[PDB]
Ligand binder design. Structure first.
Ligand code: CL
Ligand code: CL
Ligand code: CL
Lengths: 262, 259
């Protein structure tokens, strides 16, 4: 049974049973609380096929996260179209006093990403191989604000798995993109630690669909998934920071047409 | 609808069939899988498991002890350092002695969850976290052991517990009851009806010496879940006492000893 069927099943469930609800913008959503799906990474890559997912943006934004940048210019000029302490800065300089987008951060804060990599290497049985990220807007809001998302990695025999917990997920636009991003991150980490990719498990608290996305998703629901493509890494790479876009090749990606979602 | 306990029994079976033999922090083996989730309705029933007798008195008593923020082993019987309770009520405050005065120190995560449900029922950040105390001196900014996310839908309150690892034999049935209980308490305080308790795990493991007891537990048919009654209108989370709670129609199979 095709992994994408979980995603399509979840969309349908929210359309049928979702509760109408308002969020921080004046846009309506349908909402359900608590979801989980498991995508195999073993000889395949969960880049969704019921619509064309913008792979180049996934790869480029992730590399941008990884180099710890807080500058929109470094991502725009790659063709994906000062951001403050965004996810990337938190991954590489967790808990450091944020200055400018070109200040010197070398070895300040906790490098959560290198720490995940080091722990996989020093204790593959460790149940604490965890990275967290905060929505930057929460940071001045209150003392000790809760994280927006966390990733827990797990080594089982020679396979590396990842579970992403997000306190809320945009099922229409954000989720397919994130399935791809964190599956890619798992491939990168597995590669660097000499492990094979296992599963990506995606878990949500608030799983919502925007009202203006209902019609496109209803049509997406009538399309049959095609076998997932493969991700090939073209070069032995030894450090997370050494990966570049050209090291990656998606092979056999055969998707249905792009669906625009506002 | 199918019985909620069948999720737990299915998960036990799955770990026995497909789980990987591993080793945890101690010299005891486990069978283990990564990533699990179950959803237990709290609507006119309470998910206290029936395929074995769960020690309800200990669930209730330990939870009240967590809630009053105590770090004293004696107060529960019948100094642990900054255990789960202290973190719930005094998050981030420098822990010292157990008889020390912790008033207005740290963040009261529990009261904050209660206040947020009251000030913004749509908020997606109604979250509290707890750390294994042993991790605290191990490294800088260690990750949490567990998190609870609460969610108001119309007038129902739901809770999702994420634990980075769970003992499926001993710890899970007990935690299902504790966090379902906590949701009932918070729902009561905030004028809401309990909704769902969602239990999500990273490492879900069974200790090797529990395999035989669980295999036997797997042969037992769940009986309908009991109800939980709260016996008086209670105003604040700190005012609940053991005698305010009454489990009704608990009809379980016999105690299974595990350890
Ligand atoms: Cl996309
Ligand atoms: Cl028990
Ligand atoms: Cl546990």
């Amino acid at each position: 049974p095709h992994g994408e069927l979980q995603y399509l099943g979840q969309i349908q469930h929210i359309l049928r049973c979702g509760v109408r609800k308002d969020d921080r913008t004046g846009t309506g959503t349908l909402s359900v609380f608590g979801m989980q799906a498991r995508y195999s990474l073993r000889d395949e890559f969960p880049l969704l096929t019921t619509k064309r997912v913008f792979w180049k943006g996934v790869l480029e934004e992730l590399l941008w996260f990884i180099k710890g940048s807080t500058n929109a210019k470094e991502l725009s000029s790659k063709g994906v179209k000062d951001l403050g302490p965004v996810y990337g800065f938190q991954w590489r300089h967790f808990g450091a006093e944020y200055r400018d987008m070109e200040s010197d951060y070398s070895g300040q804060g906790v490098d959560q990403l290198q720490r995940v990599i080091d722990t996989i290497k020093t204790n593959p049985d460790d149940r604490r191989i965890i990275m967290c990220a905060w929505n930057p807007r929460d940071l001045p809001l209150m003392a000790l604000p809760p994280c927006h998302a966390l990733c827990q990695f797990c080594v089982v025999n020679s396979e590396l798995s990842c579970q992403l917990y997000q306190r809320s997920g945009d099922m229409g636009l954000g989720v397919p993109f994130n399935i791809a991003s964190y599956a890619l991150l798992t491939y990168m980490i597995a590669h660097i630690t000499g492990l094979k990719p296992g599963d990506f498990i995606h878990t949500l608290g608030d799983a919502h669909i925007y009202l203006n996305h209902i019609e496109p998703l209803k049509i997406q629901l009538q399309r049959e998934p095609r076998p997932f493509p493969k991700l090939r890494i073209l070069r032995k790479v030894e450090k997370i920071d050494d990966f570049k876009a050209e090291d990656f090749q998606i092979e056999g990606y055969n998707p249905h047409p792009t669906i625009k979602m506002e």
